[PDB]
Scaffold this active site. Structure first.
Site, PDB file in Angstrom:
ATOM      1  N   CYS A   1       0.802  -1.221   0.000  1.00  0.00           N
ATOM      2  CA  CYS A   1       0.000   0.000   0.000  1.00  0.00           C
ATOM      3  C   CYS A   1       0.847   1.290   0.000  1.00  0.00           C
ATOM      4  O   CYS A   1       1.568   1.575   0.964  1.00  0.00           O
ATOM      5  CB  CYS A   1      -0.961   0.025   1.198  1.00  0.00           C
ATOM      6  SG  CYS A   1      -2.003   1.541   1.192  1.00  0.00           S
TER       7      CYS A   1
ATOM      8  N   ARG B   1      -0.216   4.702   2.727  1.00  0.00           N
ATOM      9  CA  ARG B   1      -0.074   4.587   4.190  1.00  0.00           C
ATOM     10  C   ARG B   1       0.202   5.885   4.963  1.00  0.00           C
ATOM     11  O   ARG B   1       0.103   5.882   6.184  1.00  0.00           O
ATOM     12  CB  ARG B   1       0.896   3.459   4.587  1.00  0.00           C
ATOM     13  CG  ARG B   1       0.328   2.081   4.334  1.00  0.00           C
ATOM     14  CD  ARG B   1       1.392   1.026   4.628  1.00  0.00           C
ATOM     15  NE  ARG B   1       2.393   0.842   3.559  1.00  0.00           N
ATOM     16  CZ  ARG B   1       3.531   0.160   3.727  1.00  0.00           C
ATOM     17  NH1 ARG B   1       3.811  -0.383   4.929  1.00  0.00           N
ATOM     18  NH2 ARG B   1       4.372  -0.019   2.698  1.00  0.00           N
TER      19      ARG B   1
ATOM     20  N   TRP C   1      -9.376   6.063  -1.226  1.00  0.00           N
ATOM     21  CA  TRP C   1      -9.616   6.698  -2.537  1.00  0.00           C
ATOM     22  C   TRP C   1      -8.580   6.208  -3.560  1.00  0.00           C
ATOM     23  O   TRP C   1      -7.557   5.638  -3.179  1.00  0.00           O
ATOM     24  CB  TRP C   1      -9.632   8.226  -2.442  1.00  0.00           C
ATOM     25  CG  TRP C   1      -8.434   8.846  -1.794  1.00  0.00           C
ATOM     26  CD1 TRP C   1      -7.206   9.103  -2.378  1.00  0.00           C
ATOM     27  CD2 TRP C   1      -8.344   9.312  -0.445  1.00  0.00           C
ATOM     28  NE1 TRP C   1      -6.375   9.699  -1.460  1.00  0.00           N
ATOM     29  CE2 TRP C   1      -7.046   9.845  -0.271  1.00  0.00           C
ATOM     30  CE3 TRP C   1      -9.237   9.327   0.640  1.00  0.00           C
ATOM     31  CZ2 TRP C   1      -6.609  10.385   0.955  1.00  0.00           C
ATOM     32  CZ3 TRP C   1      -8.801   9.869   1.868  1.00  0.00           C
ATOM     33  CH2 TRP C   1      -7.494  10.384   2.008  1.00  0.00           C
TER      34      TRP C   1
ATOM     35  N   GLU D   1      -4.159   3.428 -11.158  1.00  0.00           N
ATOM     36  CA  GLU D   1      -4.850   2.136 -11.021  1.00  0.00           C
ATOM     37  C   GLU D   1      -6.035   2.018 -11.993  1.00  0.00           C
ATOM     38  O   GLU D   1      -6.315   0.930 -12.519  1.00  0.00           O
ATOM     39  CB  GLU D   1      -5.284   1.853  -9.577  1.00  0.00           C
ATOM     40  CG  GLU D   1      -6.159   0.620  -9.480  1.00  0.00           C
ATOM     41  CD  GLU D   1      -6.167  -0.033  -8.119  1.00  0.00           C
ATOM     42  OE1 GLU D   1      -6.941  -0.993  -7.943  1.00  0.00           O
ATOM     43  OE2 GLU D   1      -5.395   0.386  -7.234  1.00  0.00           O
TER      44      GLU D   1
END
Ligand code: HEM
Ligand code: HEM
Ligand SMILES: Cc1cc(N)nc(C[C@@H]2CNC[C@@H]2OCCNCCc2cccc(F)c2)c1
Ligand SMILES: Cc1cc(N)nc(C[C@@H]2CNC[C@@H]2OCCNCCc2cccc(F)c2)c1
Ligand SMILES: C[C@H](O)[C@H](O)[C@H]1CNc2nc(N)[nH]c(=O)c2N1
Ligand SMILES: C[C@H](O)[C@H](O)[C@H]1CNc2nc(N)[nH]c(=O)c2N1
Ligand SMILES: [Zn+2]
Lengths: 401, 404
Positions: free
Chosen positions: B108, B111, B280, B285
């Site tokens: 991720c 973070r 969000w 992506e």
């Protein structure tokens, strides 16, 4: 035992059995992965035996008379002297295999096609220079580039190494300025300063070709200037953007790595420079756009009239693409061999399939194989890879100073 | 220096050492002989050690380590496991654990936000209908009319001999993929199997490229039940481009809320098989993976043709040029519709700040380089030049096999 390897675009699966042949440890453990980081007679005897076994198997003569006798020569030499020497044909096979084995190289479809110059009869820095000049002429071939390696004398217990101080045969100077900025290539400030200290008269341009510092055993390195006519360079222009030519940018044709160690059958060759041809993203993205290199993104984006105030206009991405296109167009125009990242990665996928059939696997470093722009736009992004160390091998070595 | 991994940034020249990796209690897939870093998929005695570890983590975070309350809680946990084979978390322990699971997630890049997670406790849930209610409430809260807010909803834990709560969908919002008679796919090819399961369980399918899937929700020991999301709850963004007027005519769109629904949340040996979470989007992506992957919407050739590019040769860089404009369209359109989004440059910069924050707070940060570096423009971002160490810390989010 044998890792399962999947391609996520196509759904296909293979199993790597080649990794069982690795006899040298990498940096990872079950506790933590370190894959993203950049950096006695009996042991020598078994490395030698394994290598000779590799060589006689390659010429189909495994078990033959010639095989048995060559093993005995090696044993007799190591037992008496603590070391041994390769026959020219074994050196040739060993160099090709070290290329084949290099997990960070996207260009390995070409591994079988390598000109090997035997320079083990070299006894002075001056002789090294002549050998290097001949390599460059051959490799360059007026823009029709040919892969080559020149192998200088191996390391020996008694004495200092043959070494090329430069990291590549051709590089541009980096001149530190009064105000702490750099003129030229910031990657080369330290080697530039060494050259001056050893008597070079420096230029003051952005693209001054460096001289070579060549070291024979237990001597101070000596300075040699490369004849300008031997160093082929490509002026950079853009197919539709007229002002790009006026940026005054250029790059050299020949990528020629000179600071790596070549290990074959336990023997170590500390000077063994090699060359192929460029993949365009090395020049367009890394050499010209890295923040700690020539760092030209902002200048190109302004000439393009992009909004540089915010990241969300994707100005960096737009400029980077145009620079890469200028590199490809310019090399093609000057008739100098180059490969784009899409073509290179497609050929790498074919190499993977060839090697699965030939050897049951292929060691590969995903972070280095995937190009520095447009990663997921290339087929290698979607391909799982297993990384491990096989011998013969190319190995990094600490700068000799 | 010290015997912990040395970690270098090659752009700046700076060095740190990772000491946090010493806390790792679970093995990854690598060994000294071979690195498997690029692969996508990696008793009362055992439970108690994991539970004790987590309770110790909780008491350290509130600065009451070694206290009477700390020892009393430890005694309460093992007594509960002694009598029942399991134990239960306090509300504030669940909150701490869920935030720590996000903080620990090596894949991720978002973070920097870890401390700001709204945690909904849905551990009283007793039916599929009630799961649906909780899920609809999550979406309403998280979406917040486009001003998105990070959230997680936690359903009851795995229990001895009783079936699991499972959400069958991989996300709360996903588009249908309809297998055609010529063998091609209309909509999202990633979703062909789940689409076919929805139809088997009674869903009347659409025939569009962007039909929102219904949810298949499973309460313990029952077949899954089908629930259609009210359309007014699912915020979507029609895609247009700032200078290419024809882009709007392609009829492309994406949903606002990325909400992962099939991961297992593990806290102190307790297993939460249903605990959907949402944040969000980072724009790559959608723009790069969802729209341009050849095994997804695969729109690169279509856009390049409209742009009039030479698609018959690799060296024209037609793929690269098209991908940039599609990513730009995504950012522009979300910004126009006032829906929270972050571009890859701003996200990776904020992640570099997170790395510095965590170096000071914990002595390292587990990170998966292949996932943190964005899928376009890799080396133009600061994270490409940054070495990273990857290891497993608990609490954790873990992949789980599909229920079917
Ligand atoms: C023929 C065309 C070739 C192409 C297009 C090519 C491509 C590349 C590229 C793009 C890299 C990564 C470069 C970087 O980012 O530093 C690389 C690495 C490497 N290649 Fe090749 N290669 C070629 C030929 C060769 C040859 C002839 C050899 C040796 C015989 C070789 C051995 C290596 C090694 C050892 C590395 C890792 C270097 C390092 O750690 O700095 N390659 N290759
Ligand atoms: C605040 C906004 C957030 C952003 C911009 C963000 C960013 C991302 C991105 C870009 C990925 C890679 C996704 C992929 O390629 O499949 C990812 C993965 C992940 N993130 Fe986040 N994140 C956010 C919030 C969250 C939250 C709220 C959680 C959980 C509490 C979370 C936990 C995870 C986990 C567990 C993964 C791995 C998913 C997998 O393995 O499929 N993130 N994140
Ligand atoms: C510190 C350190 C370790 C290491 N292994 N490597 C380095 C060289 C760096 C890697 N990244 C940029 C620079 O190397 C730049 C030179 N790379 C050319 C590779 C190449 C391409 C085409 C044909 C060839 F024959 C060879 C530094
Ligand atoms: C097989 C498998 C393993 C795994 N760990 N993961 C997957 C989901 C894949 C990963 N890559 C694409 C797809 O996941 C798509 C959904 N990922 C969104 C992550 C996200 C972003 C922003 C905020 C959030 F809360 C969450 C599949
Ligand atoms: C930190 C990271 O490992 C480093 O920036 C690597 C990433 N991938 C690379 N890939 C290639 N081909 N060449 C490089 O120099 C690098 N650098
Ligand atoms: C083979 C490789 O591990 C795989 O394609 C990975 C690479 N990096 C990724 N990075 C992110 N963020 N998401 C992904 O789905 C992937 N896929
Ligand atoms: Zn590893």
């Amino acid at each position: 035992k044998f890792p399962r390897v999947k391609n996520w675009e196509l759904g296909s699966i293979t199993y790597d059995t080649l990794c069982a042949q690795s006899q040298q440890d990498g940096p990872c453990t079950p506790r933590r992965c370190l894959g993203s980081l950049v950096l006695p007679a009996e042991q020598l005897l078994s490395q030698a035996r394994d290598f000779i076994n590799q060589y006689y198997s390659s010429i189909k003569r495994s078990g033959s008379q010639a095989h048995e006798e060559r093993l005995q020569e090696v044993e007799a030499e190591v037992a008496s002297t603590g070391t041994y020497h390769l026959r020219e044909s074994e050196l040739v096979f060993g160099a090709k295999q070290a290329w084949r084995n290099a997990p960070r190289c996207v260009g390995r479809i070409q591994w079988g096609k390598l000109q090997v110059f035997d320079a083990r009869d070299c006894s002075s820095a001056q002789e090294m220079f002549t050998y290097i000049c001949n390599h460059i002429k051959y490799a360059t071939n007026r823009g029709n580039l040919r892969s080559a390696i020149t192998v200088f004398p191996q390391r020996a217990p008694g004495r200092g190494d043959f070494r090329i101080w430069n990291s590549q045969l051709v590089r541009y100077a980096g001149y530190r300025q009064q105000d702490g900025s750099v003129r030229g290539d910031p990657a080369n400030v330290e080697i530039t300063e060494l050259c001056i200290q050893h008597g070079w008269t420096p230029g003051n341009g952005r693209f001054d070709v460096l001289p070579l510092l060549l070291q024979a055993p237990d001597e101070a390195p000596e300075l040699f200037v490369l004849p300008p006519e031997l160093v082929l360079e490509v002026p950079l222009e853009h197919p539709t953007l007229e002002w790009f030519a006026a940026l005054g940018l250029r790059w050299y044709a020949l990528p020629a790595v000179s600071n790596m160690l070549l290990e074959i059958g336990g023997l170590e060759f500390s000077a063994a420079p090699f060359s192929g041809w460029y993949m365009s993203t090395e020049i367009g993205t890394r050499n010209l756009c890295d923040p700690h290199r020539y760092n030209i993104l902002e200048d190109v984006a302004v000439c393009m009239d992009l909004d540089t105030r915010t990241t969300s206009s994707l100005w960096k991405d737009k400029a980077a693409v145009e620079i890469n296109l200028a590199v490809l167009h310019s090399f093609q125009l000057a008739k100098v061999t180059i490969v784009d990242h899409h073509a290179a990665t497609v050929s790498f996928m074919k190499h993977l399939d060839n090697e699965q059939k030939a050897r049951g696997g292929c060691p590969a470093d995903w972070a280095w194989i995937v190009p520095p722009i447009s990663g997921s736009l290339t087929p290698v992004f979607h391909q799982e890879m297993v990384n491990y160390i096989l011998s013969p091998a190319f190995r990094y070595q600490p700068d000799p100073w």
